Structure 1
Amino acid sequence: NLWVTVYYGVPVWKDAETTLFCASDHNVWATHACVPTDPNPQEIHLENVTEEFNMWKNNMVEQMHEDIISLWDQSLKPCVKLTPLCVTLQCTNYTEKLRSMMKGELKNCSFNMTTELRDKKQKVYSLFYRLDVVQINKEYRLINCNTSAITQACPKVSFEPIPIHYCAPAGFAILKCKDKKFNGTGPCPSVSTVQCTHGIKPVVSTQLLLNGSLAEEEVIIRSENITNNAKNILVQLNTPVQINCTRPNNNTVKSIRIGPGQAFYYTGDIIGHIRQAHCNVSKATWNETLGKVVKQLRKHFGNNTIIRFAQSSGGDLEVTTHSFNCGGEFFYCNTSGLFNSTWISNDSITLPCRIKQIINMWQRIGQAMYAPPIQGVIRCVSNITGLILTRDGSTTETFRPGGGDMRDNWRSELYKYKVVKIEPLGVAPTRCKRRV
């Protein structure tokens, strides 16, 4: 009775992993290599399409990770390589009269540095943060000499996280969940089709997620398992918490040439008093933020329980502290003032922050970057939009700041998207018979 009819252009798709291309409207991220974005992008709501999403198996995160690593390395390649810096340093404490938390930080190190001519040497005095100089038994060396050479970041290339859009090639499409209560996995009944995602700022941080995008209605807690405490818990906030953080020292930067066309930048001196770098989070806003987090955690762990926040466990500074870039400078904030409370069934919090110039980023060994100093006082204002929490291995559950796997930050931002392959062909029975 019925005959096979072939249709081409059928609106169906299958889960697939493909290559995405960047779009964006100097900078570490090469918007020059990327493609200009669509000034009026389309989004098509699928009125009766329910689809299953899984943010933990999303290959867009893995590709974003490789693109960020690649752009970072491409940015650093055409820059001065500081091989002449792995020298013996003679360091003393910059100011022995400090009575502040900064006592012991900022060492005044002297060394015999190379010059433009191979036959000459120059004596250089510079300030280094304590974390960058390790004693060699006073005699010190740079911390990286133990494992790698340092490529100096170009002072002309900004570290500002300019938004990056990921756009699918023809034949593929990106599905957007658009579900205000979506927990990162499972059926999503409000799927819309886009070809490219919104812009994502490649903000690099640990413990706290900065900028990015806020939850529309309530704090959303996303985890691969919840039950397995070894997994990171990504908490997306409903409202931002402003964090006002600065490096108050008026560092004066001097530069010398270290080879033909090779310029080295260092902190020369500091004008005025030496002050500790710090972050400021309002107590009322943070307390409200945690209250929202505790109720949302209770929805998964049970009511009539105790939820404890505690400082992070030991490990590499990047993971145990809140690491982030500010103005191009690298801050490592203590955060203990934010995670020191037990929840049972204007007046800001000031967080000490360390500055480190030698960065071993992305958890890699064998590469290092020297972050050049910035002239003047650094001030950043940013939004805290989410947290990365871990749980201790019981009536009382204890949560601690986590991080170090940068892919989870991108997992937080990419939770809404899935990449699917379009299958334009299909067959179906009809009464239409080809005329023989």
Structure 2
Amino acid sequence: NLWVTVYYGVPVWKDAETTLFCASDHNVWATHACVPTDPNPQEIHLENVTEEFNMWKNNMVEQMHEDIISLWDQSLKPCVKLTPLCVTLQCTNVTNNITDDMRGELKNCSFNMTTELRDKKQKVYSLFYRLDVVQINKEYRLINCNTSAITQACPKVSFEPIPIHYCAPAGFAILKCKDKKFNGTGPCPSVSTVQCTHGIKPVVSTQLLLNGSLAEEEVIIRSENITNNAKNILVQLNTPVQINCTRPNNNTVKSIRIGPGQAFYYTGDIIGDIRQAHCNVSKATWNETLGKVVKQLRKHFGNNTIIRFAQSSGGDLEVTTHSFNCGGEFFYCNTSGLFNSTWISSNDSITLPCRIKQIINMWQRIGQAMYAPPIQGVIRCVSNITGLILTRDGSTTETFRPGGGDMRDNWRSELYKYKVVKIEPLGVAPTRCKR
């Protein structure tokens, strides 16, 4: 005795994969191609709903990965090409005022490079870090001259991770999980709807996560599958660990015109002693932080299980050290001093030595390279460590080691609470109504 009645505007949604666009609010991320969002974005709490989230099966991650790489390339595309630097270099060590810790490492090279006119050549002296230069057979070449062309990053563009908000296209909505202590793979009892995500800083790092969201109450340990030794474990902290990173050497930067419209930047010399780059953390804070991790980690491994941290295995420097941007310079810091302790049921610090590298092959691509111009004077940056990426070693006393591996996991962390759904306004239901 009921009839079909059609409704439009019904508050129903289905999981969907669509293309999101950026809004945000010179610099690589600072670009005028995003549409600036409101100072007052809205959020609507959904009462009496539960929804399932799966941070692993989430294509928002893939879009940030693709967009960031694309933006990266747009920034470098119009900059000076450095092909002429593949000439043979004549090199000796800089031992002028060298600390033993830095003996070797910095080299004084000279070479024949072109100038503004095709007819003329010029001789240049410049300094290089060992990581960027390899041996020909006193003759050296840049490390990338056999594999890839190298482009100089534009000196006017900073690698500042300016927050970028992502926004749904009309007809779509982003659901957000507000449930504290949510691992990211199951049902979420507290959900709200937004049009745009919070701004996310596209921070690049390899072992520790920097300047991200901090967990509200407890350390949250999550992974696709804990039992699987092939998976990474993402750990989100409740308190930041302050880390102070510096490049203590005072570099003087010089530049050369190498052809019409092109100029190359390089380190000329160092004023003062040559010392090792380094990062500091408070010893007390670090000891507390791991204790918190261990306490929660035991929930998955047992209260009769020993948790022993260890330094990572070897491989390319990018995944054996903690890499980051710091004033525009590229640092590679050894974290072995942080992951030495075995855990069984003040005014002091931990100093991490760091290396500097100017030739960058980011995103693990082969065939592309970037030359990072040197930056004048002494550089310091201070940042907040808000998480870790650890792996299992793989019948007692589990071992965990640093590793970040795939950068997709960096983005996953900020995006763990967001889901994209399609709104489906039509539907039918029976009711006592006939035309």
Cα drift, residue 105 of structure 1: 1.2
Cα drift, residue 407 of structure 1: 0.5
| In 1: Cα distance, 2:86 partner to 2:301 partner | 51
2:172 corresponds to:
172
> Which stretch has the larger CA shift, 12-21 or 94-103?
94-103
| In 1: Cα distance, 2:252 partner to 2:37 partner | 39
| In 2: Cα distance, 1:186 partner to 1:375 partner | 50
- Residue deviations 1:210-245, cap 9 Å, x none? 001100111101100000011010000011000001
CA-based RMSD of the aligned residues comes to 1.4
User: Is residue 50–residue 191 contact of structure 2 (8 Å, CA) maintained in 1?
Assistant: yes
TM-score (norm 2): 0.98
1:41 corresponds to:
41
| In 1: Cα distance, 2:393 partner to 2:309 partner | 11
- Residue deviations 1:20-44, cap 9 Å, x none? 0001111112530011111110000
2:140 corresponds to:
140
Cα drift, residue 49 of structure 1: 1.2
- Residue deviations 1:363-390, cap 9 Å, x none? 1111000000000111000000000000
User: Is residue 99–residue 273 contact of structure 2 (8 Å, CA) maintained in 1?
Assistant: no
Cα drift, residue 431 of structure 1: 0.6
> Which stretch has the larger CA shift, 97-106 or 236-245?
97-106
Correspondences of 1:115-126 after superposition (within 5 Å): 115-126=115-126
- Residue deviations 1:348-404, cap 9 Å, x none? 100000000000100111100000000011100000000000000221100000113
User: Is residue 91–residue 110 contact of structure 1 (8 Å, CA) maintained in 2?
Assistant: yes
Cα drift, residue 98 of structure 1: 2.6
2:411 corresponds to:
410
User: Is residue 97–residue 273 contact of structure 2 (8 Å, CA) maintained in 1?
Assistant: no
Cα drift, residue 313 of structure 1: 0.8
| In 1: Cα distance, 2:128 partner to 2:34 partner | 36
- Residue deviations 1:120-179, cap 9 Å, x none? 001000000010010112100001012101110001001010001110001000001001
Q: Give the secondary structure class of the aligned counterpart of 1:97.
A: coil
1:248 corresponds to:
248
| In 2: Cα distance, 1:349 partner to 1:262 partner | 43
User: Is residue 99–residue 274 contact of structure 2 (8 Å, CA) maintained in 1?
Assistant: no
| In 2: Cα distance, 1:274 partner to 1:97 partner | 6
Cα drift, residue 181 of structure 1: 1.0
- Residue deviations 1:79-127, cap 9 Å, x none? 0010001110000001166342111011000000111111000100000
Cα drift, residue 183 of structure 1: 0.4
Task: State the percentage of identical aligned residues.
Answer: 98
User: Is residue 223–residue 233 contact of structure 1 (8 Å, CA) maintained in 2?
Assistant: yes
- Structure 1 residue 29 and structure 2 residue 29: aligned? yes
User: Is residue 90–residue 138 contact of structure 2 (8 Å, CA) maintained in 1?
Assistant: yes
TM-score (norm 1): 0.98
| In 2: Cα distance, 1:265 partner to 1:380 partner | 22
User: Is residue 98–residue 273 contact of structure 2 (8 Å, CA) maintained in 1?
Assistant: no
User: Is residue 30–residue 71 contact of structure 1 (8 Å, CA) maintained in 2?
Assistant: no
Q: Give the secondary structure class of the aligned counterpart of 2:159.
A: coil
User: Is residue 175–residue 417 contact of structure 1 (8 Å, CA) maintained in 2?
Assistant: yes
| In 2: Cα distance, 1:184 partner to 1:316 partner | 31
User: Is residue 89–residue 110 contact of structure 1 (8 Å, CA) maintained in 2?
Assistant: yes
| In 1: Cα distance, 2:402 partner to 2:349 partner | 20
> Which stretch has the larger CA shift, 357-366 or 96-105?
96-105
User: Is residue 24–residue 31 contact of structure 1 (8 Å, CA) maintained in 2?
Assistant: no
- Residue deviations 1:236-271, cap 9 Å, x none? 001100000100010000000111010000000000
- Residue deviations 1:333-361, cap 9 Å, x none? 00111001100192110000000000010
| In 2: Cα distance, 1:346 partner to 1:69 partner | 41
| In 2: Cα distance, 1:424 partner to 1:81 partner | 53
| In 1: Cα distance, 2:267 partner to 2:405 partner | 29
User: Is residue 96–residue 103 contact of structure 1 (8 Å, CA) maintained in 2?
Assistant: no
2:258 corresponds to:
258
| In 1: Cα distance, 2:2 partner to 2:135 partner | 85
- Residue deviations 1:265-315, cap 9 Å, x none? 000000011111000011110111100110111001111111011111111
- Structure 1 residue 104 and structure 2 residue 100: aligned? no
User: Is residue 363–residue 404 contact of structure 1 (8 Å, CA) maintained in 2?
Assistant: no
> Which stretch has the larger CA shift, 336-345 or 28-37?
336-345
Unaligned runs of 5+ in 1: none
User: Is residue 24–residue 199 contact of structure 1 (8 Å, CA) maintained in 2?
Assistant: yes
> Which stretch has the larger CA shift, 23-32 or 42-51?
23-32
| In 2: Cα distance, 1:230 partner to 1:33 partner | 38
> Which stretch has the larger CA shift, 142-151 or 88-97?
88-97
**Structure 1 stretches (4+) deviating beyond 3 angstroms?**
none
